[PDB]
């Protein structure tokens, strides 16, 4: 649960053997078997915690996210008491463009899990703030950068971008430089926004090789 300091000396171990095994190789199967309706697919890959281990990635749908998160936090064997961050990735090639990613920590299990909800521009994702209070700002940032609406959020507002910003900057279709620029005018003694002009344009250098194979 909460890693309250217990052992005063000789706590050199990273964790116990049984706790490591249950999470090294049974964690995804345990999740799938215990809560099958929530899970659609699972990926075991390079570990977030370390290079040597393997950590799970679970794909779930927007409707089941709140119950899956509640199960992950409070299940006795799986205690993901912490939400590291919430993130979205824009995939314009896909019909469901946005992949909302949740990163969690179990201090007891010493393990990291990644939860993905695949949505589009119109659909909304239920807020998980009641499960983790840290989610509020992360979902506000996801709304600002990518435009993903989070349902039942206490107050969904933009955080990073300028006041009056309507576009979502981290969308792959948003220009790198944006659309507007800010300058002070002497005539009107105000700082004003104007359409963009660049003295020197951004130079995109195409370095791709025909012979490369790693590109997917």
């Amino acid at each position: 649960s909460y890693c309250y300091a217990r052992k005063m000396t000789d706590k050199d171990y990273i964790a116990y053997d049984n706790i490591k095994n249950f999470g090294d190789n049974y964690l995804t199967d345990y999740i799938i078997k215990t809560v099958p309706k929530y899970v659609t697919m699972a990926v075991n890959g390079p570990a977030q915690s370390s290079v040597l281990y393997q950590e799970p990635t679970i794909y779930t749908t927007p409707e089941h996210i709140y119950a899956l998160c509640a199960f992950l936090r409070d299940h006795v064997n799986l205690q993901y008491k912490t939400l590291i961050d919430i993130t979205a990735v824009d995939y314009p090639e896909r019909s469901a463009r946005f992949e909302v990613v949740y990163h969690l920590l179990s201090p007891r299990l010493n393990n990291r899990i990644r939860i993905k909800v695949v949505v589009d521009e119109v659909t909304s994702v239920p807020s998980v703030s009641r499960i983790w209070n840290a989610a509020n700002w992360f979902e506000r940032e996801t709304w600002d950068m990518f435009g993903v609406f989070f349902s039942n959020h206490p107050d969904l507002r933009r955080v990073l971008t300028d006041y009056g910003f309507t576009g979502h900057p981290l969308r792959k279709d948003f220009p790198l430089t944006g659309y507007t620029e800010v300058r002070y005018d002497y005539g009107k003694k105000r700082v004003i926004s104007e359409p963009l002009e660049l003295t020197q344009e951004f130079r995109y250098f195409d370095f791709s090789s025909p012979w490369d194979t790693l590109s997917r």
Binding site: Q200, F202, R203, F205, F207
Partner: protein, 199 residues
């Protein structure tokens, strides 16, 4: 020290808790009731005579007489290592021929896109640049361009006194960079000879 008094606290509610409850005596960090007359006098004189204050006063007063650490900036200058990344400079061969061969790698590696290069064949037949300008208001002085150059043409010199009164003077060009290389040639060469051993 770390030990705390029941009275001293920064939060009103905690002060109320400690004023009206004796759970603080269970806690190990707090200081317990004196339980002797002499201990009562000790604590009372400690609080009333501002003892802890004076102890800091002497250690601070050590500051008055200890050796001041300061540098007269114009007369004395801070130590600068050979690796130091400062004002950029294009370099020439000892014959007087520019080392630049317009590979354009430094412009490709520039994280900030501060270098614009365009070249031509010279009349003799050499691959030489007709333009090499660096925006010093866009440079981040990473030194990647000095790393990518295969002929040591571009180096970040040891000069950090290059403030200007207008931004246009901070848009360097090939002639200015070559002049900067000429001005600092010997220092740059010594630094490069030292640096060559490591890398």
């Amino acid at each position: 020290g770390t030990e705390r008094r029941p009275g001293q606290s920064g939060a009103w509610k905690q002060v109320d808790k400690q004023r009206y409850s004796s759970e603080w005596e269970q806690d190990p960090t707090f200081k317990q009731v004196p339980k002797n007359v002499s201990e009562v006098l000790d604590d009372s004189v400690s609080v009333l005579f501002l003892t802890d204050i004076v102890r800091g006063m002497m250690y601070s007063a050590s500051g008055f007489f200890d050796d001041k650490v300061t540098i007269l900036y114009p007369f004395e200058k801070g130590a600068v290592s050979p690796r130091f990344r400062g004002e950029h400079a294009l370099r020439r061969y000892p014959t007087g021929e520019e080392r630049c061969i317009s590979c354009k790698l430094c412009e490709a590696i520039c994280p900030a896109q501060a270098i614009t290069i365009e070249a031509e064949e010279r009349e003799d037949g050499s691959r030489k640049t007709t333009r090499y300008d660096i925006d010093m208001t866009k440079c981040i002085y990473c030194g990647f361009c000095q790393e990518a150059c295969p002929v040591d043409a571009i180096v970040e010199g040891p000069n950090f006194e290059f403030s200007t009164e207008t931004r246009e003077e901070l848009l360097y060009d090939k002639q200015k960079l070559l002049e900067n290389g000429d001005k600092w040639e010997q220092e740059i060469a010594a630094n490069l000879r030292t640096e060559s051993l490591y890398r």
